[PDB]
Design a protein around this ligand. Structure first.
Ligand SMILES: [Ca+2]
Lengths: 56, 220
């Protein structure tokens, strides 16, 4: 389940705020995305994250 | 910037911040209406902040100007990161804050450059600065760059930095300048972590794009 993977900053050097589902917490949480090579537990809003991963 | 120093207010007058409700990338002013940044810094709704030192306080030399156009290189590849360059047009001309010149020729290995930005200052951990940070670092040979990142370095990339670690650009510095003898030779692009031994930063090689930048600016 991609929703259970830890958030992935990736190799690029931006500081873009994205959401990831945190299964330990049962929460969509923010993290720093570097701008390229996103994995799928990486969302542009909390609503998109909850819709795709809520309850994982 | 990890391992750097405080530039001093407005001592890098061509450095801009790209803002989407918060600072997310840097850029370089190359004339009163255009900024160079990285393609992976594309977002809609960018605001360019010029004249900044403390990114978190209004200090009064600031100009906040919306992007009217944000043009990613037509051959940017978001998997290989080749052609990681973007041109941003300002909705109104900036009051000149000063532009940086484009190169006339590529720079060679060992040339000392100035890299700057508001990115993370820690190599393990997280601390974002209020004021702009600077780092002096040399361009590295293509051979060393390819041994550091096998299979990954294209002709439009170069490495710069220190193989022993501790001095490098980091998250939040993307899109910003690498200036060498007064010319914009690089764009902060990617690396393996930040300031890691044997893993120097990788930069878009601006000298390969000068005819494209000039023609694209003039056609928009
Ligand atoms: Ca300010």
């Amino acid at each position: 389940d991609f929703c259970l993977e830890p958030p992935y900053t990736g190799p690029c050097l931006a500081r873009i705020i994205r959401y990831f589902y945190n299964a330990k917490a049962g929460l969509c949480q923010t993290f720093v995305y570097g701008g390229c090579r996103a994995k799928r537990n990486n969302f542009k809003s909390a609503e998109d994250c909850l819709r795709t991963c809520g309850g994982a | 910037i990890v391992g750097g120093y405080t530039c001093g207010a407005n001592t890098v007058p061509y450095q801009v911040s790209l803002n989407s409700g918060y600072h997310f990338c840097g850029g370089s002013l190359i004339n009163s209406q255009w900024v160079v940044s990285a393609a992976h810094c594309y977002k809609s709704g960018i605001q360019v902040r010029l004249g900044e030192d403390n990114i978190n306080v209004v200090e009064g030399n600031e100009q906040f100007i919306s992007a009217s156009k944000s043009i990613v290189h037509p051959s940017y590849n978001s998997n290989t990161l080749n052609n990681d360059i973007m041109l941003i047009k300002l909705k109104s001309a900036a009051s000149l804050v000063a532009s940086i010149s484009l190169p006339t020729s590529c720079a060679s290995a060992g040339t000392q450059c100035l890299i700057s930005g508001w990115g993370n200052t820690k190599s393990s951990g997280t601390s974002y600065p209020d004021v702009l940070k600077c780092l002096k670092a040399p361009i590295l040979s293509d051979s060393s760059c390819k041994s550091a990142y096998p299979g990954q370095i294209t002709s439009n990339m170069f490495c710069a930095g220190y193989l022993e670690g501790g001095k490098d650009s980091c998250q939040g510095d993307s899109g910003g300048p690498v200036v060498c003898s007064g010319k914009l030779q690089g764009i902060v692009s990617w690396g393996s972590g930040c300031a890691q031994k044997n893993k120097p930063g990788v930069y878009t090689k601006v000298c390969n794009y000068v005819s494209w930048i000039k023609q694209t600016i003039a056609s928009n």
